[PDB]
Design a protein around this motif. Structure first.
Motif, PDB file in Angstrom:
ATOM      1  N   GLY B  58       0.760  -1.248   0.000  1.00  0.00           N
ATOM      2  CA  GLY B  58       0.000   0.000   0.000  1.00  0.00           C
ATOM      3  C   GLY B  58       0.776   1.276   0.000  1.00  0.00           C
ATOM      4  N   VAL B  59       1.933   1.231   0.612  1.00  0.00           N
ATOM      5  CA  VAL B  59       2.808   2.402   0.633  1.00  0.00           C
ATOM      6  C   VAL B  59       3.073   2.681  -0.849  1.00  0.00           C
ATOM      7  CG1 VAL B  59       5.110   3.195   1.432  1.00  0.00           C
ATOM      8  CG2 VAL B  59       3.862   1.543   2.679  1.00  0.00           C
ATOM      9  N   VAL B  60       3.458   1.608  -1.563  1.00  0.00           N
ATOM     10  CA  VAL B  60       3.824   1.562  -3.000  1.00  0.00           C
ATOM     11  C   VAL B  60       2.693   2.056  -3.935  1.00  0.00           C
ATOM     12  CG1 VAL B  60       4.824  -0.055  -4.779  1.00  0.00           C
ATOM     13  CG2 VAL B  60       5.352  -0.297  -2.404  1.00  0.00           C
ATOM     14  N   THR B  61       1.516   1.470  -3.781  1.00  0.00           N
ATOM     15  CA  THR B  61       0.350   1.803  -4.578  1.00  0.00           C
ATOM     16  C   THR B  61       0.089   3.268  -4.538  1.00  0.00           C
ATOM     17  OG1 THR B  61      -0.444   0.232  -2.983  1.00  0.00           O
ATOM     18  CG2 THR B  61      -1.623   0.391  -5.097  1.00  0.00           C
ATOM     19  N   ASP B  62       0.077   3.778  -3.311  1.00  0.00           N
ATOM     20  CA  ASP B  62      -0.192   5.188  -3.018  1.00  0.00           C
ATOM     21  C   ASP B  62       0.986   6.066  -3.286  1.00  0.00           C
ATOM     22  OD1 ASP B  62      -1.948   4.430   0.046  1.00  0.00           O
ATOM     23  OD2 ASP B  62      -2.723   4.679  -1.953  1.00  0.00           O
ATOM     24  N   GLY B  63       2.158   5.465  -3.248  1.00  0.00           N
ATOM     25  CA  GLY B  63       3.374   6.215  -3.480  1.00  0.00           C
ATOM     26  C   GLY B  63       3.383   6.571  -4.941  1.00  0.00           C
ATOM     27  N   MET B  64       2.979   5.608  -5.769  1.00  0.00           N
ATOM     28  CA  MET B  64       2.903   5.803  -7.205  1.00  0.00           C
ATOM     29  C   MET B  64       1.869   6.864  -7.452  1.00  0.00           C
ATOM     30  SD  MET B  64       3.035   1.959  -9.016  1.00  0.00           S
ATOM     31  CE  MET B  64       2.496   0.796  -7.719  1.00  0.00           C
ATOM     32  N   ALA B  65       0.690   6.671  -6.869  1.00  0.00           N
ATOM     33  CA  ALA B  65      -0.409   7.593  -7.083  1.00  0.00           C
ATOM     34  C   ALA B  65      -0.100   9.016  -6.643  1.00  0.00           C
ATOM     35  CB  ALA B  65      -1.681   7.087  -6.400  1.00  0.00           C
ATOM     36  N   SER B  66       1.090   9.242  -6.121  1.00  0.00           N
ATOM     37  CA  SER B  66       1.385  10.577  -5.647  1.00  0.00           C
ATOM     38  C   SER B  66       2.369  11.406  -6.473  1.00  0.00           C
ATOM     39  CB  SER B  66       1.736  10.463  -4.197  1.00  0.00           C
ATOM     40  OG  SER B  66       0.641   9.782  -3.626  1.00  0.00           O
ATOM     41  N   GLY B  67       2.742  10.859  -7.629  1.00  0.00           N
ATOM     42  CA  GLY B  67       3.633  11.550  -8.525  1.00  0.00           C
ATOM     43  C   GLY B  67       4.951  11.916  -7.921  1.00  0.00           C
ATOM     44  N   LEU B  68       5.808  12.543  -8.713  1.00  0.00           N
ATOM     45  CA  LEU B  68       7.139  12.939  -8.318  1.00  0.00           C
ATOM     46  C   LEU B  68       7.071  14.164  -7.425  1.00  0.00           C
ATOM     47  CD1 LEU B  68       9.931  11.795  -9.075  1.00  0.00           C
ATOM     48  CD2 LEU B  68      10.197  13.576 -10.824  1.00  0.00           C
ATOM     49  N   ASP B  69       6.114  15.052  -7.674  1.00  0.00           N
ATOM     50  CA  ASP B  69       5.900  16.251  -6.822  1.00  0.00           C
ATOM     51  C   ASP B  69       5.824  15.883  -5.280  1.00  0.00           C
ATOM     52  OD1 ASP B  69       5.512  19.069  -7.889  1.00  0.00           O
ATOM     53  OD2 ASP B  69       4.115  18.091  -9.352  1.00  0.00           O
ATOM     54  N   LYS B  70       5.574  14.608  -4.989  1.00  0.00           N
ATOM     55  CA  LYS B  70       5.439  14.126  -3.629  1.00  0.00           C
ATOM     56  C   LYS B  70       6.477  13.072  -3.295  1.00  0.00           C
ATOM     57  CE  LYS B  70       2.401  15.334  -1.651  1.00  0.00           C
ATOM     58  NZ  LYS B  70       2.581  16.362  -0.558  1.00  0.00           N
ATOM     59  N   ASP B  71       7.476  12.911  -4.163  1.00  0.00           N
ATOM     60  CA  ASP B  71       8.559  11.955  -3.960  1.00  0.00           C
ATOM     61  C   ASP B  71       8.051  10.546  -3.872  1.00  0.00           C
ATOM     62  OD1 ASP B  71      11.453  13.067  -1.860  1.00  0.00           O
ATOM     63  OD2 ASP B  71      10.875  13.491  -3.988  1.00  0.00           O
ATOM     64  N   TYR B  72       6.895  10.273  -4.508  1.00  0.00           N
ATOM     65  CA  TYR B  72       6.273   8.927  -4.552  1.00  0.00           C
ATOM     66  C   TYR B  72       5.981   8.280  -3.230  1.00  0.00           C
ATOM     67  CZ  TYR B  72       7.014   8.938  -9.513  1.00  0.00           C
ATOM     68  OH  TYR B  72       6.905   9.189 -10.869  1.00  0.00           O
ATOM     69  N   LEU B  73       5.567   9.147  -2.309  1.00  0.00           N
ATOM     70  CA  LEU B  73       5.180   8.831  -0.958  1.00  0.00           C
ATOM     71  C   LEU B  73       3.945   9.659  -0.651  1.00  0.00           C
ATOM     72  CD1 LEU B  73       7.954   9.009   1.622  1.00  0.00           C
ATOM     73  CD2 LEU B  73       6.791   6.966   1.081  1.00  0.00           C
ATOM     74  N   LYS B  74       2.942   8.999  -0.092  1.00  0.00           N
ATOM     75  CA  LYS B  74       1.724   9.655   0.314  1.00  0.00           C
ATOM     76  C   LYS B  74       2.051  10.431   1.579  1.00  0.00           C
ATOM     77  CE  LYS B  74      -2.720   7.674   1.767  1.00  0.00           C
ATOM     78  NZ  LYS B  74      -3.406   6.314   1.574  1.00  0.00           N
ATOM     79  N   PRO B  75       1.679  11.727   1.597  1.00  0.00           N
ATOM     80  CA  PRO B  75       1.885  12.647   2.717  1.00  0.00           C
ATOM     81  C   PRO B  75       1.468  11.999   4.040  1.00  0.00           C
ATOM     82  CG  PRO B  75       1.041  13.935   1.014  1.00  0.00           C
ATOM     83  CD  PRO B  75       1.017  12.448   0.500  1.00  0.00           C
ATOM     84  N   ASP B  76       2.302  12.208   5.042  1.00  0.00           N
ATOM     85  CA  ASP B  76       2.089  11.668   6.353  1.00  0.00           C
ATOM     86  C   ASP B  76       1.282  10.356   6.278  1.00  0.00           C
ATOM     87  OD1 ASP B  76       2.844  14.783   6.870  1.00  0.00           O
ATOM     88  OD2 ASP B  76       3.147  13.779   8.832  1.00  0.00           O
ATOM     89  N   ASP B  77       1.887   9.376   5.582  1.00  0.00           N
ATOM     90  CA  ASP B  77       1.321   8.021   5.431  1.00  0.00           C
ATOM     91  C   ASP B  77       1.714   7.440   6.801  1.00  0.00           C
ATOM     92  OD1 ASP B  77       1.084   5.152   4.952  1.00  0.00           O
ATOM     93  OD2 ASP B  77       1.204   5.506   2.813  1.00  0.00           O
ATOM     94  N   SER B  78       0.733   7.028   7.601  1.00  0.00           N
ATOM     95  CA  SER B  78       0.992   6.499   8.958  1.00  0.00           C
ATOM     96  C   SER B  78       1.759   5.191   8.912  1.00  0.00           C
ATOM     97  CB  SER B  78      -0.339   6.232   9.624  1.00  0.00           C
ATOM     98  OG  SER B  78      -1.089   5.340   8.798  1.00  0.00           O
ATOM     99  N   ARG B  79       1.738   4.557   7.740  1.00  0.00           N
ATOM    100  CA  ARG B  79       2.414   3.280   7.498  1.00  0.00           C
ATOM    101  C   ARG B  79       3.893   3.375   7.348  1.00  0.00           C
ATOM    102  NH1 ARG B  79      -1.625   1.705   2.708  1.00  0.00           N
ATOM    103  NH2 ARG B  79      -1.118   3.883   2.297  1.00  0.00           N
ATOM    104  N   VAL B  80       4.447   4.597   7.251  1.00  0.00           N
ATOM    105  CA  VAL B  80       5.898   4.753   7.030  1.00  0.00           C
ATOM    106  C   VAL B  80       6.746   4.980   8.297  1.00  0.00           C
ATOM    107  CG1 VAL B  80       7.751   5.789   5.523  1.00  0.00           C
ATOM    108  CG2 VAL B  80       5.434   5.559   4.625  1.00  0.00           C
ATOM    109  N   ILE B  81       7.455   3.950   8.723  1.00  0.00           N
ATOM    110  CA  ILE B  81       8.270   4.090   9.908  1.00  0.00           C
ATOM    111  C   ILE B  81       9.305   5.182   9.655  1.00  0.00           C
ATOM    112  CG2 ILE B  81       9.652   2.788  11.648  1.00  0.00           C
ATOM    113  CD1 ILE B  81       7.981   0.360  10.667  1.00  0.00           C
ATOM    114  N   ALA B  82       9.928   5.152   8.497  1.00  0.00           N
ATOM    115  CA  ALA B  82      10.886   6.178   8.164  1.00  0.00           C
ATOM    116  C   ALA B  82      11.072   6.179   6.693  1.00  0.00           C
ATOM    117  CB  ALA B  82      12.204   5.914   8.802  1.00  0.00           C
ATOM    118  N   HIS B  83      11.805   7.154   6.176  1.00  0.00           N
ATOM    119  CA  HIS B  83      12.162   7.232   4.741  1.00  0.00           C
ATOM    120  C   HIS B  83      13.045   8.406   4.450  1.00  0.00           C
ATOM    121  CE1 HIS B  83       9.182  10.495   4.029  1.00  0.00           C
ATOM    122  NE2 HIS B  83       8.652   9.892   5.081  1.00  0.00           N
ATOM    123  N   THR B  84      13.735   8.270   3.362  1.00  0.00           N
ATOM    124  CA  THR B  84      14.568   9.312   2.892  1.00  0.00           C
ATOM    125  C   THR B  84      13.704  10.060   1.828  1.00  0.00           C
ATOM    126  OG1 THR B  84      15.306   8.174   0.899  1.00  0.00           O
ATOM    127  CG2 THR B  84      16.444   7.642   3.010  1.00  0.00           C
TER     128      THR B  84
END
Ligand SMILES: [Cu+2]
Ligand SMILES: [Cu+2]
Ligand SMILES: [Cu+2]
Ligand SMILES: [Cu+2]
Lengths: 128, 128, 128, 128
Positions: B58-84
């Motif tokens: 799901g991080v992935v599905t939504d990460g894609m759906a968020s384009g490059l403008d969002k670094d392919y990560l859904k804003p404050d996705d509660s599922r993300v322990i950390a990320h660069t």
């Protein structure tokens, strides 16, 4: 260490690099290969084989035919420039080779000949 | 040599490692990500995203759906322990997380969220 | 064919197909698996496994840990919606499962759990 | 390839087929490549490129150092027997080659040269 590099083949079927530039000045070059993980040799064995990018498919293919017993490599395959053994998890093997056996302007590839691995497990020995 | 790893994501779309062990003892954990190569960020970007193995899809599905403008990560996705950051070739980024945000007995996984990548760019993380 | 599908897992780690469409009016759905080629299961083993897109990683991670001996499928894995055995070349197997186990707007992935193959061997299953 | 053969490269980085059979009697072959999905050329670009199993790698390596502005294809690569251009989703390209440009008992392959897609995206083509 200048004229040597350490390569790891894993249970996820990947090398840890896909590029190696061997240095001119170096007289011989060693490859230390290791197989972190838990899978034996017979399901997930990895060797490190080097050849020109044009001889790659022929070596993988004759290797594919040769069998687990032939380390999945055709014996005395003249297109094989250098190579290690096919090792399973937690084992290691290294191969050191004469650098004057490589020439500038030629593209080489390293690759694992275990079946289907070259799919993802290969590099350019960036000399090209 | 202990509580920080250096990883890299390349131009042939592979992380240099597919498995990180975090000794429980370390209290903060750091990951320095570098992009060897030449492919720009819009072509071959690499981020380093950590969630449970169940949330990865799901991080992935939504990460894609968020384009490059969002670094392919859904804003404050509660599922993300950390990320660069999603970094193009020739750049880097780092991230430190609290190891208390990891519980023994749970599969964690790092993957890149740049479209198409998660397939090769991924691996486990485990407290040990 | 009618509410049953024909697929292959060849020697180059490939499925012919990467998407199965199931009809809401098919009561059960049958997938017939054949492995063309000459490799034995230990080297080129193929099973067809079905789970939701979220359970795919855990299903794969755990099945790898199960061993050849268990067919790389954690036995009793409640995350699996259906699967064949793991077959070598020139072998066959089929699976028939009730279509009511699928729900509209949920995503199904089918993959092979043989060590290394799922990144190559995976596709989509969807209820029409 | 085939009187014509219609192929698809999708966003999952896959070709809907891993094998072509070009009828020895058909005089020019056509390959129609389209791209289902919603990803752009810069991220998930697809080209169908044909050569020998043998040259497959050097074209691949050489296509990559050419850039998408070049469609990751080295111009005047004598080795590429025919190719489409790199395309994004919602595109369709086509190419017709002279079929006397292939012979019996010669290993051929197709693959897309977009970086890191050659490992997934490839299949054999063979004169019937
Ligand atoms: Cu291998
Ligand atoms: Cu990436
Ligand atoms: Cu398989
Ligand atoms: Cu492609």
């Amino acid at each position: 260490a200048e004229a040597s590099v350490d390569i790891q083949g894993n249970d996820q079927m990947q090398f840890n690099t896909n590029a190696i530039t061997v240095d001119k000045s170096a007289k011989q070059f060693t490859v230390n290969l290791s197989h972190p993980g838990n899978l034996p040799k017979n399901v997930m064995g990895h060797n490190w084989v080097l050849s020109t990018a044009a001889d790659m498919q022929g070596v993988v293919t004759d290797g594919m035919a040769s069998g687990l017993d032939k380390d999945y490599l055709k014996p005395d395959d003249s297109r094989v420039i250098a190579h290690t053994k096919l090792i399973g998890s937690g084992e290691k093997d290294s191969v050191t080779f004469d650098v004057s056996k490589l020439k500038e302007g030629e593209q080489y590839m390293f690759f694992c000949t275990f079946p289907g691995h070259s799919a993802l497990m290969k590099g350019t020995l960036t000399l090209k």
